[PDB]
Each structure stands twice: as structure tokens, then as C-alpha cells.
């Protein structure tokens, strides 16, 4: 398992947690020096448990699919909560077996459904370590509407920061003050699947992408990534979604 405590959290201990989370994810090989996640894992080995502690020392345990870093559900006291999706229901027969009751959330775990449930696009939800502390607190008392918003913060500050160094650094900048995500952060989250696939099929093609990826950079300037030589590939992306799962 991996653990992160918000009491006394600084940019450095957050960094150690994101590092722990990355090499908790199994891989057999690397493509251009970036860990390639497995096509599949059978049984209870498919899931990683993250224990998160808010400032007051309350806790939730979050289950993460190691093949794609998707959050499946979480345990808050004696209640487990799982997204309304086939993947999360498969997950429920392996993790949080000892929960007194299991609730299925009224949405799936994808950004689009989470945003509808929240009443806000993630452009307008501040993120940071303070937000994460809030998110943990919101999740131990069921409320489906607040939970959607708390899950949008949790996903971005854990899973997305693991996938990209840039996003990890964004969250480190927001250690003591929340701020909405930059445009770059959002386009990165949105392009993970696309970038993963183009990096993988660039490898018999001299590092050249079959189809260019369109991103937005820091200054909000539109950019075209065409090959593995770009900074995004050499100095940003930390995990690749296997093309089998794309």
C-alpha cells in the first residue's frame, strides 16, 4: 500500500508520496524510458490501496486499478463506495470485503459524468493540498453531490500527478493555497490516452508519431507534439497506458 498524511505535509512529502505511488505500479518494460503499464493483471493484484489521512488524522482508503491508475472506489469507516461502472463492480469483489455496507455512487468515474454530478467543470474547482484535505473530509460522510467534487480533486492530485511531472509540480506549488488548474494541466489530463498510444507506436517509426497530438502549454499557447524528442515525452509523462487498453 501507499500512504500520505496531510498533517505536516509539505511539497517534499507530497513528492515522496507521488514517487511511492509511481513505483507501486507494476510494469515489465519501458518505451523510450517511460514505464509501460501492464495490459492486465488478474485477481486482487490488479488493485493498489492508497491510505489518505486528512489534517485531523481521519482516513479513507482508495482503490486504484494498476493497469490504468483509475480510481475504482474508496472505504470510509465501515462503508465502501464504488463508481457505477463495470470495472468498479469487478473491483468490489476483491477489495473492502469487510465493509458493513457497500454503496454504489450514482455516476461513473469519468471526468464528464463527474462534472455533471458536481455542477461545475474542473476548470472552476481549485486544487492543491488544502483542497485534498477538504476532499478527504467530504468523503467520509456520504453526500453524492459533494462527493463528485471531492473526487475530481482527489483524482487530479493523485492519479494525474502520478502520470505527469508537470501536474505533480502544479500541486507542489499549491501546497498551502488552492488554485484552479491551468489550461495546460487540463489538456494533459485529456491527452494521456492519446499520448500513450502515439509514444508506443512511434517505436517502429524512428520516434515519429503517426498522428500529432495537440496540447496547450504554460502561456496558454497551442502546441503540436510530433515525436518522442519533445519535452513532454522526455521530461513530463511518467506512465504509459498500454495500447491493449486503448
Amino acid at each position: 500500500d501507499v500512504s500520505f498524511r496531510l498533517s505536516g505535509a509539505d511539497p517534499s512529502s507530497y513528492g515522496m508520496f507521488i514517487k511511492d505511488l509511481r513505483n507501486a505500479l507494476p510494469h515489465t518494460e519501458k518505451v523510450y524510458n517511460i514505464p509501460l503499464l501492464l495490459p492486465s493483471v488478474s485477481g486482487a493484484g490488479r488493485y493498489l490501496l492508497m491510505h489518505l489521512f486528512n489534517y485531523d488524522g481521519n482516513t479513507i482508503t482508495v482503490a486504484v486499478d494498476v493497469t490504468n491508475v483509475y480510481i475504482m472506489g474508496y472505504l470510509a469507516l465501515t462503508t465502501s463506495y464504488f463508481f457505477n461502472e463495470p470495472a468498479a463492480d469487478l473491483a468490489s469483489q476483491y477489495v473492502f470485503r469487510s465493509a458493513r455496507r457497500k454503496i454504489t455512487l450514482p455516476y461513473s468515474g469519468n471526468y464528464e459524468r463527474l462534472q455533471i454530478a458536481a455542477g461545475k467543470p474542473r476548470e472552476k474547482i481549485p486544487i492543491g493540498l488544502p483542497a485534498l484535505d477538504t476532499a478527504i473530509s467530504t468523503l467520509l460522510h456520504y453526500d453524492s453531490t459533494a462527493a463528485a467534487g471531492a473526487l475530481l480533486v482527489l483524482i487530479q492530485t493523485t492519479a494525474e500527478a502520478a502520470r505527469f511531472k508537470y501536474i505533480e509540480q502544479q500541486i507542489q506549488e499549491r501546497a498551502y493555497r488552492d488554485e484552479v488548474p491551468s489550461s495546460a494541466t487540463i489538456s494533459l489530463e485529456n491527452s494521456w490516452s492519446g499520448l500513450s498510444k502515439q509514444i508506443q507506436l512511434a517505436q517502429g517509426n524512428n520516434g515519429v508519431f503517426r498522428t500529432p497530438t495537440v496540447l496547450v502549454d504554460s502561456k496558454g499557447n497551442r502546441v503540436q507534439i510530433t515525436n518522442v524528442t519533445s519535452n513532454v515525452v522526455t521530461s513530463n509523462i511518467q506512465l504509459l497506458l498500454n495500447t491493449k487498453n486503448i
Binding site: 508537470y166 502544479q170 506549488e173 494541466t185
Partner: peptide, 6 residues
Amino acid sequence: SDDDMG
């Protein structure tokens, strides 16, 4: 690759 805020 880039950084701060937004």
C-alpha cells in the same frame, strides 16, 4: 515540461 500556476 513547463510549469507554474494557471
